[PDB]
Structure formats: C-alpha cells, structure tokens
Amino acid sequence: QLTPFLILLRKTLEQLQEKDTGNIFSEPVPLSEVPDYLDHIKKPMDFFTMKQNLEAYRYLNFDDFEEDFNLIVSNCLKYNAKDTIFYRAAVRLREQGGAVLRQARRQAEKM
Ligand SMILES: CCc1ccc(S(=O)(=O)Nc2cc3c(cc2OC)n(C)c(=O)n3C)cc1
C-alpha cells in the first residue's frame, strides 16, 4: 500500500527530474563513454537509481533521499572541469533542485 511519505518522495523525484531538462542526470554516467569515471567517483548516482531505491523502500526518511540527490550534483562537480556543459548543469540543478527539496521537506515535517 501507498504511504503519504512515499507519495511525497515520488512527487519530489518527478519535480527534480523536471528541472533536468536535458536529461543529463536521468541515467547512470555511461562507463563505456567515460572509462575513468569510477577512478574518481566512489558512489555514482542518478535519477533512475533513485527511482529504484525509492521503490525498494530504501528511503525510510527524507534525509537519505536528499543525500542521494546531493551526490548527483557533487559527483558531477567533482568529475567535470568547470568549463563544461555537465558542470554548469550541476550548478543549475543544485540551485533549482535545492528549492524543490526545501518545499518538499516542509511537507515531510507535517508527517
Ligand atoms: C553534452 C554532450 C555529451 C553528452 C553525453 C556525453 S557521454 O556519452 O559521455 N554521457 C554522459 C557523461 C556524463 C554525464 C552524463 C552523460 O550522459 C548524459 N554526466 C552527468 C557526467 O558527469 N558525465 C561525465 C558526452 C557529451
């Protein structure tokens, strides 16, 4: 059965994906194209992996959800040079996504 909290996480995940207009963060960074990625990044994350986590009841709280979103952004800032589309997109996502999360955390607190 559905819970209000899990419904809120689903809603919030959709709102975050809407902010990623180019679908830069929809799926894992492809190791075939970026063969040194795991040399630098210890815990890859992306929205499809978050959707999998959400549906396996691994976000028992909001914190753990926000932490995975923040990894999407921090991994991208860490890996990519500043003068890239990826780095700029992660800065934009940090800005827009942070605002989605702040509002969503307020709703979570009422539960
Ligand atoms: C902007 C043109 C471009 C898109 C995808 C690629 S990719 O085939 O290398 N895929 C890819 C790489 C990513 C990436 C996302 C990618 O596919 C969308 N992110 C978030 C990231 O940090 N890296 C290094 C390369 C260039």
Curated annotation (Swiss-Prot):
PTM summary: Acetylated by KAT6A.
Tissue expression as described in the entry: High levels in testis.
Domain annotation Bromo: ranges: 1-104
Subcellular localization, as worded in the UniProt entry: Nucleus; Chromosome; Cytoplasm
Superkingdom, natural source: Eukaryota
Signal sequence segment: none
Binding partners and assembly: Component of some HBO1 complex composed of KAT7/HBO1, MEAF6, ING5, and BRPF1. Component of the MOZ/MORF complex composed at least of ING5, KAT6A, KAT6B, MEAF6 and one of BRPF1, BRD1/BRPF2 and BRPF3. Interacts (via PHD-type zinc finger domains) with unmethylated histone H3 at 'Lys-4' (H3K4me0). Interacts with trimethylated 'Lys-36' of histone H3 (H3K36me3). Interacts with ING5; interaction directs BRPF1 to H4K4me3-enriched chromatin at the 5' of active genes. Interacts with KAT7.
Descriptive protein name: Peregrin
Biological source species: Homo sapiens
